[PDB]
A paper describes a structure:
Myosin heads comprise a motor domain (MD) that hydrolyses ATP, a regulatory domain (RD) that includes the essential (ELC) and regulatory (RLC) light chains, and a proximal S2 subfragment. During relaxation, two myosin heads pack together to form an interacting-heads motif (IHM; [Woodhead et al., 2005]).
Human β-cardiac myosin ELC, RLC and MHC (MD and S2) were modeled as described. A rigid fitting of this model was done against the human cardiac negatively stained thick filament 2.8 nm resolution 3D-reconstruction (EMD-2240) using the Chimera ‘Fit in Map’ option. The new model fitted well to the 28 Å resolution 3D-reconstruction for the negatively stained human cardiac thick filament (EMD-2240). Sarcomere proteins depicted are MHC (BH: gold, FH: olive), essential light chain (ELC associated with BH: brown, FH: purple), and regulatory light chain (RLC associated with BH: dark blue, FH: blue). First, there are neither atomic nor near-atomic structures of the human cardiac IHM. We found that only HCM variants were significantly enriched in many IHM interacting residues, most notably in those that stabilize the IHM (p=5.37e-16 vs. expectation).
Author numbering:
A (entry chain B): 147 to 339
B (entry chain D): 44 to 195
C (entry chain F), F (entry chain E): 7 to 166
D (entry chain B): 630 to 678
E (entry chain B): 727 to 871
G (entry chain A): 824 to 871
The structure:
């Protein structure tokens, strides 16, 4: 660690390097306020693990997806949880409207073993009518825009928009993302699960 | 110093083996200079190998070829080295791990020391070094370990 | 004879309970001296209907190089061992191209074979290449030399 | 058995009483968290906008 | 190697300070503990890379002996190439003929039908094959077992 | 001349492993005075070594007539070589009561066999049936089919 | 065919030879060689 400076990979480097050797159980606690990019940060902690410690073939220069599928599934579950769990608040387009605790597991020799995640609360209250400029759970908008004319029948979506009554205010946007293509990505993340 | 009739045969055999060609030519690569000398019995670092390289090439394949005329003035030089190592250096060395006077070594702590500093071994070579059998949570011992290394 | 001792060989025993039994079964189609002989004059007769090709006065004793004389019941064993021995079998014949691959279950890299054929020491001629081209068994992006040789062993046909 | 004010465990029925369910798990997370090595990142916010 | 002799053995603790202080290592920016050792940012890392350039002798001699262990057994590849390579030529000069040959296929179909095929040699092997497999199955149960 | 091959061979169990061999090697004991040419007397003596009578001279004389004459090491073997048809292979007879039904391994009732042979096919006689019947391992009303099949065919009855 | 000229020469004198000799013994013995090897394959990998 001199080539390993003060970016989140380091703390996670030092935690892993430390733990596999000492065998005592550990933690990673990030605090902050409303939109203190918490969720984006922890995925970086995981992105250290998911590509360093585990048995992933590095010896080729490919963008990467080079195994192992434990690492691939552990990653995808996070976006999956974000689509369902995250909505949007006046401060934060990506307001994880819930809470999760993650116990990462490691094996005998080096590499990853699994993860135990529990959940605290969820904003089920909002579903009726949201206050100001918020959006309801991401999973919805994704299903509306990306779904094909076939699924539209069975699934029973409105063809037209602004029909949906549980969506207060209107159809609020997020800066720089779509609603549509994010659907196909995560749906594949289910196949990957 | 100069090579005896027995030593010349040792050098000739290994060199003739190294000539890998459909039509033959009688040459070795500078990269192959590593394991040649090793098979010859002299135990060198890659630092020792490159030290006798005609080309300031480092590791790669497809740089320079050396004849037997060139290879022998390499071998003749190599023979001079004295510091090869014994057993008891390694005993003194490996004892440092201890905390309670057991001379016992956990598997993870043992694999990591192999990988980290020096010319280094890989993840793969560690898998080869330890493939069992039937001791959990999960200890090796320093005495039997070193003696098997030297035993070959 | 110690240098006649090269690679390629395997050794068996005299008795056979019911293993080489097969020769008693086959006998009738081929036989010469029914006592139990195939002699110097029978190669010039039977092999004409056993081989895809031909014998010339140039390669006489060479075409018989393995068995130039009295192949008795005692001797048949060391023509069979000579199946595993022959003209550099298996250990050389097969391993020759097999040794090429840097990493594992390979196949000889076609275009580079064409390269060496016209370059490495004795520059060959176009005739051999074109006959070879139509006769190349390229299983997907590399010349399967291993089978191009090993077709004559394995166990999964019976024609010739 | 369900003795109510809730729930199922914990405990019997009043539709919800989730705040009591947030007592049980709260003990289970915390006491163990004391016994685990702390790693921390104290993320601060630059603007409201 | 100047300060700590090894083989006839030193204290569990007292050995570390010289193995630290060899390449100097600034005093404040390291700390001793019981199992876990503590370091600061900066000072540690690059001094830890430098230990590749510096750690000759025993460290690299263990790895080197392992290199010699490996290489003595598993160099292969180039070994049988030269002899085969010459022979490849001995074939290549006659490719137009090759396909017209002797040993092909007549030796096969019966083999699935016959009973106790490869007898005599396997007969010589029989007793040792019977005994050792049981001798193994004795140990190769009992444990997990 | 490379268009004169001998291709294709092994159908079933031609020279059956337990019949063919032990005959060719036996030749030295049949060939009495050691010429290779078995006269009617070379037979005459060897069958005397076997058991008590032996076929008459005419009965051996017809066997000599089956061959083109000089029963020697060439002819005797070749006259044997072609003759494969007659008996059925072991597995074929053996599977008869095994394929008795889709399910599924118990024992076959001797009443069903008695009802079949008499009536469904070539109507065997009262004599033919009960004769072949009598020698039967009848484990309680059902036949040990494979063993009776062994009684039909196995290593056994000389001297023929 | 219980009264033919050239066939049922089998056991009465012929087993002065070999051939038949070992067969049945090996049938009883080969059973043991297989099962010991089969278990020897599967066992260790089960304990893994």
């Amino acid at each position: 660690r001199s080539e390993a400076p003060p970016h989140i990979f380091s703390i996670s480097d030092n935690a892993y390097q430390y733990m596999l050797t000492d065998r005592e159980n550990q933690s990673i606690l990030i605090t902050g306020e409303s939109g203190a990019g918490k969720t984006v940060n922890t995925k970086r902690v995981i992105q250290y693990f998911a590509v360093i410690a585990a048995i992933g073939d590095r010896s080729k220069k490919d963008q990467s997806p080079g195994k192992g599928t434990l690492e691939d599934q552990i990653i995808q579950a996070n976006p999956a949880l974000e689509a369902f769990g995250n909505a949007k608040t006046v401060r934060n387009d990506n307001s994880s409207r819930f809470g999760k605790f993650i116990r990462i597991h490691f094996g005998a020799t080096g590499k990853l073993a699994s993860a135990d995640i529990e959940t605290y609360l969820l904003e089920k209250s909002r579903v009726i009518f949201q206050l100001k400029a918020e959006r309801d759970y991401h999973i919805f908008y994704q299903i509306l825009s990306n779904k094909k004319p076939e699924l539209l029948d069975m699934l029973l979506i409105t063809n037209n928009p602004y029909d949906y009554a549980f969506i207060s205010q209107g159809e609020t946007t997020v800066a720089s993302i779509d609603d549509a293509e994010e659907l196909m990505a995560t749906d594949n993340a289910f196949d990957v699960l | 110093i100069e090579f005896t009739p027995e030593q010349i045969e040792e050098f000739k055999e290994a060199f003739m083996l190294f000539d890998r060609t459909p039509k033959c030519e009688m040459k070795i690569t500078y990269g192959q200079c590593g394991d040649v000398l090793r098979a010859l019995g002299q135990n060198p670092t890659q630092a020792e190998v490159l030290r006798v390289l005609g080309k300031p090439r480092q590791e790669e394949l497809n740089t320079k070829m050396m004849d037997f005329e060139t290879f022998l003035p390499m071998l003749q030089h190599i023979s001079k080295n004295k510091d090869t190592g014994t057993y008891e250096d390694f005993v003194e060395g490996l004892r440092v791990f201890d905390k309670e006077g057991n001379g016992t070594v956990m598997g993870a702590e043992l694999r990591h020391v192999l990988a980290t500093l020096g010319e280094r071994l890989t993840e793969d070579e560690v898998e080869k070094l330890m493939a069992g059998q039937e001791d959990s949570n999960g200890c090796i011992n320093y005495e039997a370990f070193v003696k098997h290394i030297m035993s070959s | 004879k110690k240098r006649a001792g090269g690679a390629n060989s395997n050794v068996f025993s005299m008795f056979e309970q019911t293993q080489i039994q097969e020769f008693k079964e086959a006998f009738t189609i081929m036989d010469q001296n029914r006592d139990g002989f195939i002699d110097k004059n029978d190669l010039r007769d039977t092999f004409a209907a056993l081989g895809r090709v031909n014998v010339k006065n140039e390669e006489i004793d060479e075409m018989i190089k393995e068995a130039p004389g009295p192949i008795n019941f005692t001797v048949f064993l060391t023509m069979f061992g000579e199946k595993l021995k022959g003209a550099d079998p298996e250990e050389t014949i097969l391993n020759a191209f097999k040794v090429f691959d840097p990493e594992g279950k390979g196949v000889l890299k076609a275009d580079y074979v064409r390269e060496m054929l016209t370059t490495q020491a004795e520059r060959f001629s176009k005739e051999e290449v074109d006959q070879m081209f139509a006769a190349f068994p390229p299983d997907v992006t590399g010349n399967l030399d291993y089978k191009n040789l090993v077709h004559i062993i394995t166990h999964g046909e019976e024609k010739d | 058995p369900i003795e109510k004010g809730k729930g199922k465990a914990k405990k019997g029925s009043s539709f919800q009483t989730v705040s009591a369910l947030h007592r049980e798990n709260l003990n289970k997370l915390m006491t163990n968290l004391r016994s685990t090595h702390p790693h921390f990142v104290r993320c601060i916010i630059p603007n409201e906008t | 190697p100047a300060a700590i002799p090894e083989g006839q053995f030193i204290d569990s603790r007292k050995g570390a300070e010289k193995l630290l202080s060899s390449l100097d290592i600034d005093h404040n920016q390291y700390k001793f503990g019981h199992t876990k050792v503590f370091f600061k940012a900066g000072l540690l890392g690059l001094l830890e890379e430098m230990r590749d350039e510096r750690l000759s002798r025993i460290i690299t001699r263990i790895q080197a002996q392992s290199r010699g262990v490996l290489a003595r057994m598993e160099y292969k590849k180039l070994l049988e190439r030269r002899d085969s390579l010459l022979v490849i030529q001995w074939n290549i000069r006659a490719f137009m003929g090759v396909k017209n040959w002797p040993w092909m296929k007549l030796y096969f179909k019966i083999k699935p039908l016959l009973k106790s095929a490869e007898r005599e040699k396997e007969m010589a092997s029989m007793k040792e094959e019977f005994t050792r497999l049981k001798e193994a199955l004795e140990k190769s149960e009992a444990r997990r077992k």
